[PDB]
């Protein structure tokens, strides 16, 4: 009875439009002379918010996008549940999140269609959103979902977040090939540059060098030839071994 | 259980020392999309190529070619009316709603 | 008494799967890196990060090179890093350098 | 915890009798005919005067409200029987959602004139339907119906014979116990509990997760392909250390050239001769290469 | 590339996005658990992902290398190194508008800072706790008033 | 040190003169109490609760002593205090120098091969942004900071504009709270 006169409801959408439904400018200069004369709080309040105001106004990008019905995805691989041996497997759960959703848009979607006291839909809907969010992060809002053992679960969010900040990531040193680590002695017989040399050391290590060398004195075949002979460990080795040295 | 084993993945692992050349010649589809798109779907040197094709747009795409086969194939789901010719006699229905005709036709 | 030329590598973070059969393959520190800095051998480090770190490629790749002993496959790109991006996007994150 | 806000929220609903519907359906349903014969009207047009349309389509509004309306005045039940089967499967709600369905379904499924707490009926659909539901979105990789079927059956068994055995059975003791090969049960459980996420960190601190400490058997050697093509093309070279045809002859002899073995007539077909003629020269030039220097030249490729 | 300004920054439109994803899917699903082989709409249209196997149109059909750059009339997929999976990208699609957390979830999340509105509430919108004025007459409620 | 870096406040806070003129000390109940005749003179900057522990200072022409004429940066008592003031009253010029010495100085306590720069080097640091007191018309929330060098840089933008009456100021900036100041997002992102 009346209705004809407007639109009143909820959801982005409506809102969304409210994005649409908007001018900077208006708001802009608005807050402009706002602060220009009135002041404080309010001003400060505005003022500030006038910030972001410009934030857009400025660049040619719309808050519009802030709404959501298209969405991307993790490519495969990324969320892998590769077989844990012993007939076992493990992946990016979360995927679940996806799922879940899938179950939903598929679901309350698949509802649609039918139609009913929405509530229902609302219920999910939001429920979705939520669940999504969860995607974003978990109990960040409310009760964080937690796998059995109430194990809460890794959010979007995470990643370069938490210790595993691919941030943090790099800044950490790590183990790598050919780790000359051992005790030591001087060697009176010394000359700068000079230094110890437990041989069977990179002896062991160096190898790949000659490994291409070697059969250059065609005395192995491939390298498995040599190599495998690296297992043989053969007086010859000590030699051009020398060279590479 | 701290003690590294190897889980186990899935999927081959070519030594397919790649080149580029000499390969298999191809061909293309480009089918038209609802919107109009032509997600141009190349193909091997030869083969059948569809009439349509579900678009990377998740939608689908009939030929990029004015070929143009058929659309039909759909079919209805159930109606609660269908559930009526189900568990109900029409002329009963017929009336019942007719009775209604009385009712709101009654005031 | 150990080091490690190579061997196993975290089926995840394929780093030197250290172990019995393995020499572990010593981990490395961050200061250190800073030392570099105090020089800047870049590469070097970088390299590491790439190389013996877990440069799947050059590992393979220059590993070859090596194998073929030649003006080594010059240092490439933080790759993975590449991922990122993706990783970002991921959240409507798209941007870019130019 | 919305639902709470729901639940309550939903409690806004207003329960009712068990006969309003008697009509209502008579209503409503009277609607289904309303559009129905209505639809006839539309088809011929032949529209009855405005009033006919208001009291009709309007009365269609009757059936609408009255139904939904009641449906609502039934969810509290929905709602109810829903509550309990938790601690397993799906979002309490979502769960519901599917309950709502078995509703929905059974909903439009009940001849009231039959005289039944249909709701109770629906309690198929209701129950069942969702029962399926679990039989639906249970696993991230679920299981073929039958399998689980006999499974639930099984693990149920498990309880049976630990609980009752005062201690869990023993495979064999079960396979026979349940009358099969224990291997069977094994694979079952293998189907039971999923093989864990990985996303769980490494059990502890824990500063790694699951994976952290594994490296698949499947493992890039550094010398394969490597050689392999060293091989491989190195071969090809050798593949030229003699004549000609003998290629596709032999390359085809395993499709080696085109990646697909064949038949003496398949190839020689090309040269036109005889499987005879084919494998004759074939195995011969083998002998050629069956020769050793033919070999060691590629032997370490062994 | 070697020659990189800095990294100008922003988001993306569903376009982009949609303009990006190798399609989407729709099946809380993945592979055959048993045969061990993924699905479609369920996680892992390798087709829109890539094999797990180097140049091998999932309809097996091919697996060579001269086979390459190829579209699969059969299993639609192409031909090469899965990995590009990972490297590919897929999207998601809703049944209605939705929101990004922050300026909502944030704190003090903009949205108000973006709109100057009853956050707490507002939310209520997104959490649908009470409608609000998404349009207005002034005309009928004008003149007609 | 440490805080001597992070420049919070000396628990051994020590009063520090201001203008000059003489001084009307007046100790007591440990809490001394004093009042320096500003050379202005007139209104004397006064101090009261001045526990005897941190008893008076000295100054050669030696020992602290009331009545005497007074000094500007003149640290009142023995002990440490708020360089934040020294600036706030004198800018870093010494301060800097202060600091510095205060640090070497420490190494002095250790006697070590030391050179200054390091700090210098620093120095350049915690002083780099001025505050953001009064945009006047630069529309930058008060209190806030800016690369000084900006604002300035900014300012120029002033170009009249109505003489963009932006107000910011000298600014210590605590290594951490420091550091916060930056630009490479992704950095603090790592933070
Ligand atoms: Zn295929």
UniProtKB/TrEMBL annotation, chain B:
GO terms for biological process: positive regulation of DNA-templated transcription. One of its GO terms (molecular function) is bacterial-type RNA polymerase core enzyme binding. It comes from the Bacteria. Keywords: Transcription, Transcription regulation. It holds the Pfam family RbpA. InterPro entries: RbpA_sf, RNApol-bd_RbpA. Binds to RNA polymerase (RNAP), stimulating transcription from principal, but not alternative sigma factor promoters. Belongs to the RNA polymerase-binding protein RbpA family. Forms a complex with the RNAP catalytic core and with free principal sigma factors. This is RNA polymerase-binding protein RbpA. It comes from Mycobacterium tuberculosis. The lineage of its organism: Bacteria, Bacillati, Actinomycetota, Actinomycetes, Mycobacteriales. The gene is rbpA.
Automatic annotation (TrEMBL), chain C:
It comes from the Bacteria. Residues 24-98 form the RNA polymerase Rpb2 domain. Belongs to the RNA polymerase beta chain family. The RNAP catalytic core consists of 2 alpha, 1 beta, 1 beta' and 1 omega subunit. When a sigma factor is associated with the core the holoenzyme is formed, which can initiate transcription. DNA-dependent RNA polymerase catalyzes the transcription of DNA into RNA using the four ribonucleoside triphosphates as substrates. This is DNA-directed RNA polymerase subunit beta. It comes from Mycobacterium tuberculosis. The chain holds residues 1035 to 1132 of 1172 of the full protein.
From TrEMBL, chain D:
Residues 94-107, 263-289 form the RNA polymerase sigma-70 domain. GO terms for biological process: DNA-templated transcription initiation. Residues 149-225 are annotated as: Sigma-70 factor domain-3. Residues 238-291 are annotated as: Sigma-70 factor domain-4. It comes from the Bacteria. Residues 264-283 bind DNA. One of its GO terms (molecular function) is sigma factor activity. Keywords: Cytoplasm, DNA-binding, Sigma factor, Transcription, Transcription regulation. Residues 70-140 are annotated as: Sigma-70 factor domain-2. A motif (Interaction with polymerase core subunit RpoC) lies at residues 94-97. Sigma factors are initiation factors that promote the attachment of RNA polymerase to specific initiation sites and are then released. This sigma factor is the primary sigma factor during exponential growth. Belongs to the sigma-70 factor family. RpoD/SigA subfamily. This is RNA polymerase sigma factor SigA. It comes from Mycobacterium tuberculosis. The lineage of its organism: Bacteria, Bacillati, Actinomycetota, Actinomycetes, Mycobacteriales. The gene is sigA. The chain holds residues 226 to 527 of 528 of the full protein.
Automatic annotation (TrEMBL), chain E:
Zn(2+) 1 binds at residues 57, 59, 72, 75. It comes from the Bacteria. Belongs to the RNA polymerase beta' chain family. The RNAP catalytic core consists of 2 alpha, 1 beta, 1 beta' and 1 omega subunit. When a sigma factor is associated with the core the holoenzyme is formed, which can initiate transcription. DNA-dependent RNA polymerase catalyzes the transcription of DNA into RNA using the four ribonucleoside triphosphates as substrates. This is DNA-directed RNA polymerase subunit beta'. The chain holds residues 4 to 148 of 1316 of the full protein.
